[model samples]
Target: TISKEYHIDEEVGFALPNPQENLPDFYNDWMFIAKHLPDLIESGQLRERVEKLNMLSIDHLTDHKSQRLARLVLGCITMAYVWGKGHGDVRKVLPRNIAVPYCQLSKKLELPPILVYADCVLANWKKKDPNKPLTYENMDVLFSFRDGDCSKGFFLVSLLVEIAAASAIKVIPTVFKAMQMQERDTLLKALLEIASCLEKALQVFHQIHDHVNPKAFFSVLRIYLSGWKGNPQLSDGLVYEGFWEDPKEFAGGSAGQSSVFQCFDVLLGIQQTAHAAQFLQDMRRYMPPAHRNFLCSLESNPSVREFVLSKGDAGLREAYDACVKALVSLRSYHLQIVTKYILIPASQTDLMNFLKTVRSTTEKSLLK
Candidate 1:
């Protein structure tokens, strides 16, 4: 097992998990002035009606652009607070003070929250305006950090995990919801969009060069890149040969929900497939928490096997088939990017072990 001593202090601390208290100094952009909003709202700052301490509001003293970015941070953090930590409960995750202002600010700001922001951050192209076309004009806020100088840095790998985590929350629900509804038309449309989005994402991954000494990222941080099954309770302490020592273990995160491909399992009704039974069981742990219960509980629902096999109509069945094709193509593209960025840089990887261990776009794969 990796060390639990996450005493992250300085340069030497990159190998450890970041502690909960005292976030890194890296987020010091002017938009972060009100980073203490949670503390302020929780305090009696509002009780005395004292204007001085009433808010941990963003830079009330800065430009509108600076102000909105701070609001963007506020909304994104709130997204994490609700979904990541709270397991999709707004009431459980937020106080009225925090919730009320966040809703108001996000309405005005119109910025992407955490899930969407994760995609925007590393993407080379962006949809700048809803009224206009996609743009690569250096207008994206995330572009501020995309110089690729830190792309291969070990610390940055943790960031990649975070982005995948947030994006999974948004994307998984979308496709999974369509399957539950039996809305073939909507499912097809969502599949196309995810395919397009993943296509663009791989473009940004291609540009991420190991600008730092590759050793730190490769030797240390790479090990932490694992599927949800990496959990000791889940995998029962499995280990892989190439990367780790001990029993059979793989570290690649489930990254399950991120793929548009999971809908394939949904549409095909994976349980009845000639081969998917054990694989889907293995994949269960890696799925996102909010959606995992629903996805697995789908067994009781009349699924693709019943719907498609019972002659739900040729058009519906055809659409399901098309969805699988799209997922396969989508994941194939992702593994190619992984092969280049993750494999080429690291080198000497065992191919079967790599595929077996890293679940990102493949694994108990829907795209299979």
Candidate 2:
């Protein structure tokens, strides 16, 4: 009866008799829905949808750009399944038409579908114009690739697309109510686990790709929030007061120079840390007593601390701190905006009320 309800066909590529060779239990359940579940009340068969998706996947693999695009699609579908199965309200309220568009956009923009759906819902709530108008021009912007500095812009655009898509799915109010009524710990745990794994995989992919080039290294320092090891001399001479007045002036002038030196320094530091006995000794504990003594033995020598500090501008303390802080703030804001606009939304009115409460609290806290 269960198999009949799921419509698990032998030809569907999911009927593994041996439990060990079969898909995970959750995924096995998912395949049943994918295979048997009907499309939205208006759409055609679920089998047809799956066939269409398979064709798209094949088309994507024919080219390099398309291959990358396909990965994004895969990521989104994975998220969609998790969300749909985890929340009963999501299954009940999300139309097949909506899911199709969500998947298409996710493929186009190379973003997670859930995030894309969330953004649409939020846009609807605020009565804001959909930035993505489902037009060719908009889609072009969504799928464009870039090198060097433009990479950040590309990533930001994709992020916006995902957020909009997630918002469009609109089950927050009903889902929240259902959650309150039912204590479905299994579903909750499964959702959280899947979400965590998906996020980590995406993060690792981004990290690796972003760190693969010289430009990425520079971007990491300029835009990254932590682990800066660059020049102390030039950095020490910078004027902090007027820094924000013309941020680009400094960034453009110094990024290339800093990047070269910083890259070399990082490489050398890593090598020294790995191979040098004295360096290893010093690194092993708070400070190597022998290495400290050896450095102190020099009559006009700087202390070991001073030596370590001198790698950048006499030591690039301020620059490192500034860059790291900027990076932290940038990432923090992204997380905050996503959480505020998407994941935490319960209902249109409830979300608005929550925002008001947050704003009022922020104002009071700032005054204090």
Candidate 3:
């Protein structure tokens, strides 16, 4: 029932199922530019090419999958258009050809016009071989900021994490049902399943280092995934031409915005520190509306931690503690990865010069 209730797929978890391969002929212009964004940026022809695109009608994308693919393509094109000029030439205003339809599709999807985790990771992949499992080797990102192994690795590895978390996601409702019926053993068993699922997800999370180059991640792909809000590069925000009278600010796509950890945190009643809680709560707006509603429903339901504590059963307490411990391990390892991929690289470079003011920023920054 969680599948229907929350739009959580049993197999793919949060990742969009059967992501469409192409858009209709009407959007071929937008699709072509998105498909070759990295190449166009490298050639310094992205702006001219993007501006040449004729604004298309969003009404043609009548189904969920087409709209999802359209959003993915448009989001990539927007990032490349804004940041593709090697940071030295950051565009404050998005052109009307891409901006108007992008905003309309965003409203249709209930996601922001800027790329979010849902656009980059959840709805951004396709199985390389239809017969194989959704593992890293068998999966590929439908679009990217650059044409490279790191970009594919980054998206696919994140997708795999979502796949691994599917088990835990499905068991959440069972745990709740067990608690509601006061079936202590059933509750304990369900909690242990959630803990194991979290542990399995942690294993998949580590594969990012094996597949992605940290330097490239910091230098290249990171910029495309960024948003206008809290970003020094676009501090005031970006103006979507013809869509709004004023610039708009939205947070970039981030793993924090992923619903996997939030669902686990809620199921175990794990209390995040105040600062973490505030940031995590703010990221909820980036999730799909149904997924966001699912977390809200869990919060409104009776407390799982309270149920465990009142019973005073050693098995229940230990089972509950295991889920918490597994989640902590996953989150703590996330801190280590951030330090390696983001903080360590950032500390080693003059970030401002790397992000802005350089005519050939990508070439110089990737060297670091």
* Highest lDDT against the true fold, candidate: 3
Per-residue alpha-carbon lDDT of candidate 3 for residues 298-367, written as tens digits (9 for 90 to 100): 7877888888788868887788777777766775677677778888888773432322222121122110
lDDT, model 1, position 32: 39
Residue ranges of candidate 1 with Cα displaced over 4 Å: 1-220, 223-264, 270-288, 297-299, 309-317, 346-368
- Predicted candidate 2 versus true structure: per-residue lDDT over 1-368, tens digit per residue: 01122212222111111112122343332234332322311242332343233222233234333333333333333323322222121221223433444446444543333322112111111111345343213422221111242433333333332332222112222322333454344323332332333243234324323323434333321231111123222232222121123111111111111111121122112222221334223332211122123222322222222322444332233322332232233334444543443344422355345434433322332101
Q: TM-scores for all candidates?
A: 0.38, 0.25, 0.92
Please estimate how well model 1 matches the true structure, expressed as its whole-model Cα lDDT. Answer: 0.37
| lDDT score at residue 336, model 3, on the 0-100 scale | 73
lDDT of 1 by residue, 1-368 (tens): 12122221122121112212222344343223234333433452321222222234432524433333444454434333332222222212233434444445444443222222212222212234645532223222322221222422322332343332222223434555666776767655654554454444444433334334444344433332322234433344332222234443322433332322343355345432232344545444433232344444444445544545455566545555554444454446556655654676776545534443333333333323
**What pairs collide in candidate 3?**
none
**True-structure lDDT of candidate 2:** 0.28
Candidate scoring better on TM-score of 2 and 3: 3
By summed lDDT, which 10 consecutive residues of candidate 2 come out lowest? Answer: 247-256
Query: What is the lDDT, from 0 to 100, of the residue 13 in candidate 2?
Result: 12
Q: What is the lDDT for 33 in model 1?
A: 26
